[PDB]
Write an enzyme that holds these catalytic residues in place. Structure first.
Site, PDB file in Angstrom:
ATOM      1  N   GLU A   1      27.859  -7.820  40.194  1.00  0.00           N
ATOM      2  CA  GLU A   1      27.003  -6.548  40.030  1.00  0.00           C
ATOM      3  C   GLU A   1      26.383  -6.358  38.616  1.00  0.00           C
ATOM      4  O   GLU A   1      27.306  -5.780  37.860  1.00  0.00           O
ATOM      5  CB  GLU A   1      27.468  -5.337  40.808  1.00  0.00           C
ATOM      6  CG  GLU A   1      27.008  -3.916  41.091  1.00  0.00           C
ATOM      7  CD  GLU A   1      27.666  -2.908  41.734  1.00  0.00           C
ATOM      8  OE1 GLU A   1      28.768  -3.053  41.855  1.00  0.00           O
ATOM      9  OE2 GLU A   1      26.794  -1.730  41.825  1.00  0.00           O
TER      10      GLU A   1
ATOM     11  N   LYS B   1      20.054  -2.095  45.810  1.00  0.00           N
ATOM     12  CA  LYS B   1      21.201  -1.567  46.536  1.00  0.00           C
ATOM     13  C   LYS B   1      20.695  -0.404  47.474  1.00  0.00           C
ATOM     14  O   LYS B   1      19.921   0.543  46.958  1.00  0.00           O
ATOM     15  CB  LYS B   1      22.045  -1.071  45.665  1.00  0.00           C
ATOM     16  CG  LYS B   1      23.533  -0.725  46.108  1.00  0.00           C
ATOM     17  CD  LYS B   1      24.457  -0.573  44.568  1.00  0.00           C
ATOM     18  CE  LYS B   1      25.935  -0.105  44.856  1.00  0.00           C
ATOM     19  NZ  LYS B   1      26.428   0.043  43.626  1.00  0.00           N
TER      20      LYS B   1
ATOM     21  N   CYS C   1      28.032  -4.432  46.514  1.00  0.00           N
ATOM     22  CA  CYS C   1      29.263  -3.583  46.566  1.00  0.00           C
ATOM     23  C   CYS C   1      29.286  -2.617  47.697  1.00  0.00           C
ATOM     24  O   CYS C   1      29.581  -2.915  48.747  1.00  0.00           O
ATOM     25  CB  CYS C   1      29.597  -3.045  45.224  1.00  0.00           C
ATOM     26  SG  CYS C   1      31.028  -2.534  44.614  1.00  0.00           S
TER      27      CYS C   1
ATOM     28  N   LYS D   1      43.795  -1.653  45.759  1.00  0.00           N
ATOM     29  CA  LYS D   1      42.565  -1.961  46.016  1.00  0.00           C
ATOM     30  C   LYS D   1      42.453  -3.249  46.655  1.00  0.00           C
ATOM     31  O   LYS D   1      41.373  -3.610  47.347  1.00  0.00           O
ATOM     32  CB  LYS D   1      41.710  -1.650  44.700  1.00  0.00           C
ATOM     33  CG  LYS D   1      39.990  -2.019  44.909  1.00  0.00           C
ATOM     34  CD  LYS D   1      39.437  -0.723  45.409  1.00  0.00           C
ATOM     35  CE  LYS D   1      37.918  -0.587  45.150  1.00  0.00           C
ATOM     36  NZ  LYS D   1      37.581  -0.260  43.698  1.00  0.00           N
TER      37      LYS D   1
ATOM     38  N   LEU E   1      56.072   4.669  16.946  1.00  0.00           N
ATOM     39  CA  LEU E   1      57.005   4.373  17.977  1.00  0.00           C
ATOM     40  C   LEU E   1      58.260   5.469  17.888  1.00  0.00           C
ATOM     41  O   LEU E   1      58.568   5.990  16.706  1.00  0.00           O
ATOM     42  CB  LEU E   1      57.816   3.225  17.522  1.00  0.00           C
ATOM     43  CG  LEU E   1      57.372   1.763  17.876  1.00  0.00           C
ATOM     44  CD1 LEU E   1      58.277   0.592  17.282  1.00  0.00           C
ATOM     45  CD2 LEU E   1      56.802   1.483  19.358  1.00  0.00           C
ATOM     46  N   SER E   2      58.633   6.170  18.922  1.00  0.00           N
ATOM     47  CA  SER E   2      59.633   7.139  19.070  1.00  0.00           C
ATOM     48  C   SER E   2      61.073   6.632  19.118  1.00  0.00           C
ATOM     49  O   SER E   2      61.961   7.355  19.210  1.00  0.00           O
ATOM     50  CB  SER E   2      59.232   7.919  20.192  1.00  0.00           C
ATOM     51  OG  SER E   2      59.742   7.438  21.535  1.00  0.00           O
TER      52      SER E   2
ATOM     53  N   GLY F   1      61.622   5.642  22.208  1.00  0.00           N
ATOM     54  CA  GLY F   1      61.611   5.807  23.665  1.00  0.00           C
ATOM     55  C   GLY F   1      60.822   4.967  24.587  1.00  0.00           C
ATOM     56  O   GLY F   1      59.970   4.113  23.808  1.00  0.00           O
TER      57      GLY F   1
ATOM     58  N   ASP G   1      58.185   5.158  26.469  1.00  0.00           N
ATOM     59  CA  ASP G   1      56.614   5.357  26.371  1.00  0.00           C
ATOM     60  C   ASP G   1      55.888   4.371  25.561  1.00  0.00           C
ATOM     61  O   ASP G   1      55.346   3.595  25.786  1.00  0.00           O
ATOM     62  CB  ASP G   1      56.152   6.622  26.448  1.00  0.00           C
ATOM     63  CG  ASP G   1      56.512   7.457  27.657  1.00  0.00           C
ATOM     64  OD1 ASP G   1      56.873   6.963  28.757  1.00  0.00           O
ATOM     65  OD2 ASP G   1      56.488   8.801  27.394  1.00  0.00           O
ATOM     66  N   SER G   2      56.335   4.711  24.267  1.00  0.00           N
ATOM     67  CA  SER G   2      55.712   3.621  23.222  1.00  0.00           C
ATOM     68  C   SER G   2      56.504   2.688  23.274  1.00  0.00           C
ATOM     69  O   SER G   2      55.645   1.427  22.766  1.00  0.00           O
ATOM     70  CB  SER G   2      56.301   4.701  21.925  1.00  0.00           C
ATOM     71  OG  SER G   2      57.476   4.717  21.482  1.00  0.00           O
TER      72      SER G   2
ATOM     73  N   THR H   1      50.486   7.049  23.419  1.00  0.00           N
ATOM     74  CA  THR H   1      51.503   6.827  24.132  1.00  0.00           C
ATOM     75  C   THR H   1      51.874   7.942  25.067  1.00  0.00           C
ATOM     76  O   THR H   1      52.910   7.726  25.772  1.00  0.00           O
ATOM     77  CB  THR H   1      52.553   6.286  23.376  1.00  0.00           C
ATOM     78  OG1 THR H   1      53.185   7.619  22.553  1.00  0.00           O
ATOM     79  CG2 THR H   1      52.343   5.010  22.158  1.00  0.00           C
TER      80      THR H   1
ATOM     81  N   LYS I   1      33.759   9.690  18.900  1.00  0.00           N
ATOM     82  CA  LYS I   1      34.291  10.810  18.314  1.00  0.00           C
ATOM     83  C   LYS I   1      33.740  12.077  18.946  1.00  0.00           C
ATOM     84  O   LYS I   1      34.641  12.927  19.235  1.00  0.00           O
ATOM     85  CB  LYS I   1      33.789  10.856  16.737  1.00  0.00           C
ATOM     86  CG  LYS I   1      34.362  12.074  15.827  1.00  0.00           C
ATOM     87  CD  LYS I   1      33.955  11.933  14.403  1.00  0.00           C
ATOM     88  CE  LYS I   1      33.999  10.690  13.677  1.00  0.00           C
ATOM     89  NZ  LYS I   1      33.764  10.857  12.145  1.00  0.00           N
TER      90      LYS I   1
END
Lengths: 542, 540
Positions: free
Chosen positions: A45, A125, A161, A193, A299-300, A302, A304-305, A405, A510
């Site tokens: 598509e 479509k 689609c 999906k 980086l923490s 932890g 997540d990061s 993060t 931005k």
């Protein structure tokens, strides 16, 4: 009796606005199809323009560019004798006259068949998605006409689609004589999906009895990741071919008359493997399509990061990733040790920058108003903002993007700081709940194919012109969607028009993080202006 | 004569209780003035536009309860009929499937007579361009609604139903002698002319007078300007209400003939834009419960304009100005900044940034060894100032009003997390050319005793994560009612805490960077919520 048809499924990774590059990718797919002896190639598509282009679809010059690219493409396909190509593109009926304000009237989401270097026919479509991530009723008009063509003695019907979501389009195609349905798609990934797609197409096949060929886009486009996973179902709904997810390339499938023949079926990926590959492809393409030199990750120590670091290294390679730990006075030694450990495991540059001097200075500057008040989130947020400022300084000086993060759980309950831990260019795990962050780290630690195992520490897982001119050009370009050549003809220099309009494009990233502001014009930088960040559309000045 | 009250109301998205109170107050005024009929704006009951609240089954349940309450509260006003807009879902909190088109949700207006809903109109032509996305939310209905009051037949159509001939024709064929049009029409420069022109095209086709009632007030980026009006059956303007003010006005009809009434005096384009900025600031602060505003003052024209708007919107006592000089900020700038703050009577403070800036520079000295100072270090300075204003905002509760203009937004003369740090970008849609015109306007409009705001010299220069995640998924991803989340085994305390924090933090998410969607309902285009909202769902 019946003839065979050899079909190339072109699971392309096109780029929004990159007409030149997209033409080149389609031609390359066609070369490969020709080399394989295919009669027919199917692209996704809006392949020609990339997908979704959003409010580029309100700009007359975008459709003019698409029409010119379609003509270039057809010329370049002409040498592949006997190869027909079905390609998606935006289409405006017969150029740069204003697109009005009022509903779409003559713009369509189209797929054209190119035969012998000419357009042989076009489908538009019918069922325009205008829920979830799509807004096609903002951009396109509906058309109810079917498109059926004959190739190797077989009648092929085209639908696009979300046309498959209801009975109508497929039934109109069958009534017009279709024996096989061909479906170009720009279907974004989400968990499960892949199951949704096969279930919906099976509903249509129960109604029509016609086999279906489903070709999907692959690649990242801003928040979306298209996962490919193109496939073929026979007239009983059995899966007979299935391409890999998250990979670009071509596969050959065959029909004998209207009977779909067996081909390669890629083994199913687990849900964790699918999500991880989505994150890798999203990062790889946001950096690549935008031309960033690399990535920066705070980086923490932890989890997540850690996950973001793992994804970035898999997407870009270690040489294009750096890690920065920014300890305060409170920061535990185990946190810096954990951060340095993981950076070593993946082989990325690692630096520590202490934030105490900046924090002390802020605290001093505010001493008169805050003295005697309990410390609360205010002081924590200053620390987070100092960290964001440091990472953005490194980004500004050397050009790498900051990957943020914050996870979905944190986004939800506001366990995050504007301009602090939220400061950056791309929020890799913004849609990953904390529970899933852990599961994905365990997944990646065990996933042999990525190379280095056990990279996330186990212990964390068990825990300018003058303003009058500038404003005139902005009004014409931004507010009124005028072609650059019409801005020049109104008495502005080519140099000024090029400079101003390029800067408007460049700064989309931005504006998209700006606070809400007050609309007083008919086209503000709010809901009036919905543009992609990832875009290679460069309009010609003449 | 039929006496019709035009209720040009400033309702708040989600504020069912308060919107009901406003409509009842308008009804009281109308009843005292002997009105037969009061007309409120588009989606008055719920406020407008509620965006993805219109995908949430509980929101429609709340709207139905509010409509029942309103009808009961209106019952004592004998002899007065009230036309009120509201979102409507056909006959409870069963899911609204977000993957297929709307089927049974409508943009509606119901007539309340004798404390009961007498009848309902559903919108036909749904706007889905510019700032509206109504085909994401609502289904079309082409049935007319016509009713009789004081011997005259009135037909109802809603806002963009007037863009085409159809809805008005269907109402006229159903017996309409006068058309009544509730609207949620946002301001833009010259929109007033667009409205009269389109209604005149309909009047050419029908010969029926039209009564146009518009919303007023700020709602996130939008400012509704009011400017409600009446056209007679030849298209002549016979009544017009003021722009950017709430009120009630009575217009009279003799049979189906519209009679002349008050036509408000005109405002220049600059005067209109200025009042739009004032109303937008007043309402963003007020409707969101902020106690005041903070403005970074540079000594330049843009922050001067934003200061002026903020003081006009909120009063000097709710605004503070902060100048944040670097080591080499020119003395003319700090004098001009202090002078501006004195002239409008606001609290002024200076906070030097050199100590923070020197600390950042030392921390980056090894990294930047041998390189010139360039835009990178300018941006650090801007981010220090943003951090300072946000600290003041965080500690004491006032919102930071940012001062970046449309020209700057366009060409990128702005810094993420720096001059863009704050809660509300007052002049984000004002080109630099227009900033100067608005400053000249505000100087021209000065009261006695106040002198130029801007001098000429300047002008010419929590539960555990497994529980939290389950609640998030049900509430955010699946739009489930709070009571159903409780019935699934989660505590009322947890469900209330988690879901109130989701709402509270919309403002913050809306400035986040783009991120990767992997679920069917991410915090990108899947999730389009108002920031300004007082929707509070019952826990049971």
């Amino acid at each position: 009796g019946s003839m065979k048809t050899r079909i190339a499924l072109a699971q392309l990774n096109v780029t929004v606005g990159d007409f030149a590059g997209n033409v080149a990718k389609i031609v390359a797919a066609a070369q490969a199809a020709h080399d394989a002896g295919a009669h027919f190639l199917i692209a996704p598509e809006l392949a020609l323009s990339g997908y979704p282009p959003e409010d580029l679809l309100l700009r007359p010059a975008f459709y003019a560019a698409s029409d010119a690219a379609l003509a270039e493409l057809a010329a370049q396909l002409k040498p592949f004798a006997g190869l027909a190509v079905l390609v998606g593109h935006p289409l405006r009926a017969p150029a740069n006259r204003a697109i009005e304000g009022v509903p779409p009237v003559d713009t369509y989401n189209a797929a054209s068949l190119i035969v012998g270097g000419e357009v042989a026919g076009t489908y538009r479509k019918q069922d325009l998605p205008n829920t979830e991530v799509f807004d096609e009723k903002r951009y396109f008009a509906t058309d109810a006409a079917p498109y059926v063509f004959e190739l190797n003695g077989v009648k092929f019907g085209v639908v696009i689609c979300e046309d498959v979501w209801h009975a109508s389009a497929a039934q109109l195609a069958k009534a017009a004589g279709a024996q096989v349905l061909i479906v170009p798609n720009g279907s974004p990934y989400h968990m499960n999906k892949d199951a949704v797609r096969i279930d919906i197409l099976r509903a249509r096949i129960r109604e029509t009895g016609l086999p279906m060929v489903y070709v999907n886009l692959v690649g990242g486009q801003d928040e979306l990741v298209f996962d490919g996973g193109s496939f073929v179902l026979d007239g009983a709904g059995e899966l007979v071919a299935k391409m890999p997810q998250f990979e670009e390339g071509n596969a050959i499938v065959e029909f004998d008359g209207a009977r779909a023949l067996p081909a390669a079926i890629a083994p199913a990926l687990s849900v964790e493997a699918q999500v991880y590959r989505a994150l890798v492809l999203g990062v790889r393409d946001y950096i690549g399509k935008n031309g960033f030199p690399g990535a920066i990750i705070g980086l923490s120590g932890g989890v997540d990061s850690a996950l973001v670091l793992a994804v970035a290294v898999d997407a870009l390679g270690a040489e294009r990733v750096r890690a920065v730990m920014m300890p305060s006075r409170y920061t535990a030694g185990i946190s810096t040790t954990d951060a340095a450990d993981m950076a070593r495991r993946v082989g990325v540059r690692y630096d520590e920058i202490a934030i105490a001097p900046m924090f002390d200075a802020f605290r001093a500057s505010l001493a008169a108003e805050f003295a005697g008040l309990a410390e609360d989130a205010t002081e924590e947020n200053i620390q987070a903002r100092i960290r964001g400022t440091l990472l953005m300084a490194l980004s500004n000086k050397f050009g790498s993007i900051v990957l943020t993060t914050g996870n979905k759980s944190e986004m939800a309950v506001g366990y995050c700081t504007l301009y602090g831990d939220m400061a950056g260019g791309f929020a890799v795990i913004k849609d990953i709940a904390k529970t899933l962050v852990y599961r994905l780290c365990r997944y990646r630690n065990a996933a042999a194919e990525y190379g280095q195992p056990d990279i996330v520490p186990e212990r964390i897982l068990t825990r300018l012109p003058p303003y009058d001119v500038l404003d005139a050009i902005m009004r014409m370009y931004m507010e009124e969607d005028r072609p650059l050549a019409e801005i020049v003809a109104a008495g502005y220099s080519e140099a000024d028009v090029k400079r101003v309009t390029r800067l408007i494009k460049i700064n989309e990233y931005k504006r998209r993080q700006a606070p809400v502001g007050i609309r007083v014009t008919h086209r503000a930088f709010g809901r009036d202006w919905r543009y992609p960040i990832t875009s290679r559309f460069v309009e010609s000045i003449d």
